[PDB]
Amino acid sequence: DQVVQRIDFADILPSVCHPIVHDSTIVERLMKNEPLPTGHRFSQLCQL
Amino acid sequence: DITKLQNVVNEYLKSKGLNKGNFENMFTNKEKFESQFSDIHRALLRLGNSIRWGSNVPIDTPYVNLTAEDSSEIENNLQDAEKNML
């Protein structure tokens, strides 16, 4: 029904402030086991 | 003679066969560029392939080459040059 309903960052907190967002473990594992870039990006990106 | 050897041998072997070391061929193109200090850095890494072809099942060996007395005489010649560049 035509009720004005409002959403905020204070309302979004219980889904954005969870520790599984702020973990790095799964991102580290997946970006590790993902295959490496190619040669012509590899000269540009993986050098430092 | 460094340009003739590095051009003719290194790039053309790694292009004619074993097409994986073209990143190292870009490195040896920058070695052909006049950045000698950084160029001679990782001469170990571009020596390891010569170790792989001089002796089968590649190991790490000493940096100077295969013959022992020639290996010592190279270092004697390099000390002679370092004392007298002229």
PDB file of all heavy atoms in Angstrom, chain B residues 9-22 25 49 52-53:
ATOM      1  N   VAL B   9      71.623 -15.150 -30.834  1.00  0.00           N
ATOM      2  CA  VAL B   9      71.436 -16.404 -30.128  1.00  0.00           C
ATOM      3  C   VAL B   9      70.149 -16.395 -29.318  1.00  0.00           C
ATOM      4  O   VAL B   9      69.264 -17.231 -29.529  1.00  0.00           O
ATOM      5  CB  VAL B   9      72.671 -16.666 -29.263  1.00  0.00           C
ATOM      6  CG1 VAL B   9      72.390 -17.715 -28.235  1.00  0.00           C
ATOM      7  CG2 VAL B   9      73.787 -17.071 -30.178  1.00  0.00           C
ATOM      8  N   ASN B  10      70.011 -15.428 -28.411  1.00  0.00           N
ATOM      9  CA  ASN B  10      69.061 -15.561 -27.311  1.00  0.00           C
ATOM     10  C   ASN B  10      67.612 -15.412 -27.776  1.00  0.00           C
ATOM     11  O   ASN B  10      66.784 -16.312 -27.544  1.00  0.00           O
ATOM     12  CB  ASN B  10      69.388 -14.522 -26.241  1.00  0.00           C
ATOM     13  CG  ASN B  10      68.984 -14.955 -24.846  1.00  0.00           C
ATOM     14  OD1 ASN B  10      69.330 -14.297 -23.864  1.00  0.00           O
ATOM     15  ND2 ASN B  10      68.287 -16.084 -24.744  1.00  0.00           N
ATOM     16  N   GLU B  11      67.306 -14.317 -28.478  1.00  0.00           N
ATOM     17  CA  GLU B  11      65.951 -14.045 -28.948  1.00  0.00           C
ATOM     18  C   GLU B  11      65.510 -15.099 -29.946  1.00  0.00           C
ATOM     19  O   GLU B  11      64.366 -15.562 -29.920  1.00  0.00           O
ATOM     20  CB  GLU B  11      65.901 -12.693 -29.646  1.00  0.00           C
ATOM     21  CG  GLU B  11      66.349 -11.512 -28.852  1.00  0.00           C
ATOM     22  CD  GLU B  11      66.399 -10.275 -29.725  1.00  0.00           C
ATOM     23  OE1 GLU B  11      66.069 -10.382 -30.928  1.00  0.00           O
ATOM     24  OE2 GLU B  11      66.814  -9.205 -29.236  1.00  0.00           O
ATOM     25  N   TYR B  12      66.423 -15.476 -30.836  1.00  0.00           N
ATOM     26  CA  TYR B  12      66.067 -16.347 -31.938  1.00  0.00           C
ATOM     27  C   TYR B  12      65.949 -17.788 -31.484  1.00  0.00           C
ATOM     28  O   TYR B  12      65.137 -18.525 -32.034  1.00  0.00           O
ATOM     29  CB  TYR B  12      67.034 -16.170 -33.095  1.00  0.00           C
ATOM     30  CG  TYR B  12      66.900 -14.767 -33.638  1.00  0.00           C
ATOM     31  CD1 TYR B  12      67.744 -13.768 -33.221  1.00  0.00           C
ATOM     32  CD2 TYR B  12      65.883 -14.420 -34.490  1.00  0.00           C
ATOM     33  CE1 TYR B  12      67.606 -12.463 -33.656  1.00  0.00           C
ATOM     34  CE2 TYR B  12      65.733 -13.116 -34.951  1.00  0.00           C
ATOM     35  CZ  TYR B  12      66.604 -12.140 -34.528  1.00  0.00           C
ATOM     36  OH  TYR B  12      66.471 -10.851 -34.980  1.00  0.00           O
ATOM     37  N   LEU B  13      66.713 -18.216 -30.470  1.00  0.00           N
ATOM     38  CA  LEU B  13      66.422 -19.526 -29.895  1.00  0.00           C
ATOM     39  C   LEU B  13      65.070 -19.517 -29.219  1.00  0.00           C
ATOM     40  O   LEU B  13      64.243 -20.398 -29.471  1.00  0.00           O
ATOM     41  CB  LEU B  13      67.514 -20.004 -28.925  1.00  0.00           C
ATOM     42  CG  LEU B  13      67.061 -21.239 -28.096  1.00  0.00           C
ATOM     43  CD1 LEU B  13      68.004 -22.427 -28.136  1.00  0.00           C
ATOM     44  CD2 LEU B  13      66.852 -20.895 -26.614  1.00  0.00           C
ATOM     45  N   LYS B  14      64.800 -18.510 -28.392  1.00  0.00           N
ATOM     46  CA  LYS B  14      63.564 -18.586 -27.626  1.00  0.00           C
ATOM     47  C   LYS B  14      62.339 -18.309 -28.495  1.00  0.00           C
ATOM     48  O   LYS B  14      61.214 -18.627 -28.098  1.00  0.00           O
ATOM     49  CB  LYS B  14      63.638 -17.676 -26.415  1.00  0.00           C
ATOM     50  CG  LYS B  14      64.676 -18.153 -25.414  1.00  0.00           C
ATOM     51  CD  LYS B  14      64.786 -17.296 -24.167  1.00  0.00           C
ATOM     52  CE  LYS B  14      65.868 -17.873 -23.260  1.00  0.00           C
ATOM     53  NZ  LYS B  14      66.084 -17.062 -22.038  1.00  0.00           N
ATOM     54  N   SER B  15      62.529 -17.718 -29.676  1.00  0.00           N
ATOM     55  CA  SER B  15      61.432 -17.622 -30.636  1.00  0.00           C
ATOM     56  C   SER B  15      61.299 -18.891 -31.475  1.00  0.00           C
ATOM     57  O   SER B  15      60.182 -19.382 -31.676  1.00  0.00           O
ATOM     58  CB  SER B  15      61.623 -16.409 -31.542  1.00  0.00           C
ATOM     59  OG  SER B  15      62.712 -16.626 -32.411  1.00  0.00           O
ATOM     60  N   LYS B  16      62.424 -19.419 -32.001  1.00  0.00           N
ATOM     61  CA  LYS B  16      62.404 -20.606 -32.861  1.00  0.00           C
ATOM     62  C   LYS B  16      61.907 -21.827 -32.110  1.00  0.00           C
ATOM     63  O   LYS B  16      61.211 -22.670 -32.674  1.00  0.00           O
ATOM     64  CB  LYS B  16      63.795 -20.896 -33.442  1.00  0.00           C
ATOM     65  CG  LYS B  16      64.223 -20.038 -34.633  1.00  0.00           C
ATOM     66  CD  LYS B  16      65.627 -20.398 -35.036  1.00  0.00           C
ATOM     67  CE  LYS B  16      66.158 -19.426 -36.065  1.00  0.00           C
ATOM     68  NZ  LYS B  16      67.572 -19.796 -36.412  1.00  0.00           N
ATOM     69  N   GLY B  17      62.246 -21.943 -30.840  1.00  0.00           N
ATOM     70  CA  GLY B  17      61.727 -23.021 -30.035  1.00  0.00           C
ATOM     71  C   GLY B  17      61.423 -22.515 -28.646  1.00  0.00           C
ATOM     72  O   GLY B  17      61.876 -21.445 -28.240  1.00  0.00           O
ATOM     73  N   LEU B  18      60.643 -23.326 -27.930  1.00  0.00           N
ATOM     74  CA  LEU B  18      60.357 -23.140 -26.502  1.00  0.00           C
ATOM     75  C   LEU B  18      59.734 -21.771 -26.240  1.00  0.00           C
ATOM     76  O   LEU B  18      60.285 -20.948 -25.510  1.00  0.00           O
ATOM     77  CB  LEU B  18      61.606 -23.366 -25.644  1.00  0.00           C
ATOM     78  CG  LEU B  18      62.055 -24.797 -25.293  1.00  0.00           C
ATOM     79  CD1 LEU B  18      60.951 -25.570 -24.573  1.00  0.00           C
ATOM     80  CD2 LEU B  18      62.605 -25.587 -26.492  1.00  0.00           C
ATOM     81  N   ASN B  19      58.584 -21.514 -26.872  1.00  0.00           N
ATOM     82  CA  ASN B  19      57.992 -20.177 -26.887  1.00  0.00           C
ATOM     83  C   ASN B  19      57.308 -19.829 -25.567  1.00  0.00           C
ATOM     84  O   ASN B  19      56.100 -19.569 -25.534  1.00  0.00           O
ATOM     85  CB  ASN B  19      56.989 -20.058 -28.040  1.00  0.00           C
ATOM     86  CG  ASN B  19      57.632 -20.289 -29.399  1.00  0.00           C
ATOM     87  OD1 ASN B  19      57.266 -21.218 -30.121  1.00  0.00           O
ATOM     88  ND2 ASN B  19      58.613 -19.463 -29.737  1.00  0.00           N
ATOM     89  N   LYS B  20      58.081 -19.806 -24.479  1.00  0.00           N
ATOM     90  CA  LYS B  20      57.603 -19.396 -23.167  1.00  0.00           C
ATOM     91  C   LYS B  20      58.457 -18.308 -22.548  1.00  0.00           C
ATOM     92  O   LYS B  20      57.996 -17.633 -21.618  1.00  0.00           O
ATOM     93  CB  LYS B  20      57.553 -20.599 -22.198  1.00  0.00           C
ATOM     94  CG  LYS B  20      58.859 -20.913 -21.428  1.00  0.00           C
ATOM     95  CD  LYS B  20      59.955 -21.491 -22.310  1.00  0.00           C
ATOM     96  CE  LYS B  20      61.120 -22.004 -21.493  1.00  0.00           C
ATOM     97  NZ  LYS B  20      62.254 -22.424 -22.360  1.00  0.00           N
ATOM     98  N   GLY B  21      59.683 -18.120 -23.031  1.00  0.00           N
ATOM     99  CA  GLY B  21      60.607 -17.198 -22.413  1.00  0.00           C
ATOM    100  C   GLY B  21      60.649 -15.877 -23.138  1.00  0.00           C
ATOM    101  O   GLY B  21      61.677 -15.198 -23.141  1.00  0.00           O
ATOM    102  N   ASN B  22      59.529 -15.499 -23.750  1.00  0.00           N
ATOM    103  CA  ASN B  22      59.452 -14.232 -24.460  1.00  0.00           C
ATOM    104  C   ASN B  22      59.343 -13.046 -23.517  1.00  0.00           C
ATOM    105  O   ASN B  22      59.715 -11.933 -23.899  1.00  0.00           O
ATOM    106  CB  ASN B  22      58.281 -14.265 -25.438  1.00  0.00           C
ATOM    107  CG  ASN B  22      58.464 -15.310 -26.517  1.00  0.00           C
ATOM    108  OD1 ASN B  22      57.710 -16.277 -26.593  1.00  0.00           O
ATOM    109  ND2 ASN B  22      59.478 -15.125 -27.357  1.00  0.00           N
ATOM    110  N   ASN B  25      62.707 -12.531 -23.142  1.00  0.00           N
ATOM    111  CA  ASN B  25      63.210 -11.873 -24.346  1.00  0.00           C
ATOM    112  C   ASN B  25      62.913 -10.382 -24.353  1.00  0.00           C
ATOM    113  O   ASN B  25      63.694  -9.606 -24.903  1.00  0.00           O
ATOM    114  CB  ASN B  25      62.624 -12.493 -25.617  1.00  0.00           C
ATOM    115  CG  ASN B  25      63.085 -13.915 -25.848  1.00  0.00           C
ATOM    116  OD1 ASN B  25      62.270 -14.824 -25.974  1.00  0.00           O
ATOM    117  ND2 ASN B  25      64.397 -14.119 -25.893  1.00  0.00           N
ATOM    118  N   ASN B  49      69.122 -21.262 -17.987  1.00  0.00           N
ATOM    119  CA  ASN B  49      68.750 -21.968 -19.205  1.00  0.00           C
ATOM    120  C   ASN B  49      69.969 -22.560 -19.900  1.00  0.00           C
ATOM    121  O   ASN B  49      69.899 -23.666 -20.458  1.00  0.00           O
ATOM    122  CB  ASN B  49      68.020 -21.008 -20.140  1.00  0.00           C
ATOM    123  CG  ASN B  49      67.274 -21.718 -21.240  1.00  0.00           C
ATOM    124  OD1 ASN B  49      67.259 -22.946 -21.309  1.00  0.00           O
ATOM    125  ND2 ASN B  49      66.640 -20.949 -22.114  1.00  0.00           N
ATOM    126  N   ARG B  52      70.648 -25.606 -18.085  1.00  0.00           N
ATOM    127  CA  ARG B  52      69.706 -26.622 -18.546  1.00  0.00           C
ATOM    128  C   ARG B  52      70.138 -27.261 -19.862  1.00  0.00           C
ATOM    129  O   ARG B  52      69.921 -28.461 -20.071  1.00  0.00           O
ATOM    130  CB  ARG B  52      68.320 -25.996 -18.702  1.00  0.00           C
ATOM    131  CG  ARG B  52      67.221 -26.992 -18.996  1.00  0.00           C
ATOM    132  CD  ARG B  52      65.875 -26.321 -19.163  1.00  0.00           C
ATOM    133  NE  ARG B  52      65.795 -25.547 -20.396  1.00  0.00           N
ATOM    134  CZ  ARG B  52      64.758 -24.789 -20.734  1.00  0.00           C
ATOM    135  NH1 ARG B  52      63.703 -24.702 -19.933  1.00  0.00           N
ATOM    136  NH2 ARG B  52      64.772 -24.124 -21.879  1.00  0.00           N
ATOM    137  N   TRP B  53      70.764 -26.497 -20.754  1.00  0.00           N
ATOM    138  CA  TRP B  53      71.205 -27.105 -22.005  1.00  0.00           C
ATOM    139  C   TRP B  53      72.605 -27.697 -21.952  1.00  0.00           C
ATOM    140  O   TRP B  53      72.887 -28.630 -22.710  1.00  0.00           O
ATOM    141  CB  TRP B  53      71.135 -26.103 -23.158  1.00  0.00           C
ATOM    142  CG  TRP B  53      69.747 -25.858 -23.578  1.00  0.00           C
ATOM    143  CD1 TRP B  53      69.007 -24.742 -23.346  1.00  0.00           C
ATOM    144  CD2 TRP B  53      68.886 -26.781 -24.257  1.00  0.00           C
ATOM    145  NE1 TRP B  53      67.746 -24.893 -23.871  1.00  0.00           N
ATOM    146  CE2 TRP B  53      67.646 -26.139 -24.433  1.00  0.00           C
ATOM    147  CE3 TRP B  53      69.050 -28.082 -24.750  1.00  0.00           C
ATOM    148  CZ2 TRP B  53      66.571 -26.753 -25.078  1.00  0.00           C
ATOM    149  CZ3 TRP B  53      67.979 -28.692 -25.391  1.00  0.00           C
ATOM    150  CH2 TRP B  53      66.757 -28.026 -25.549  1.00  0.00           C
TER     151      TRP B  53
END
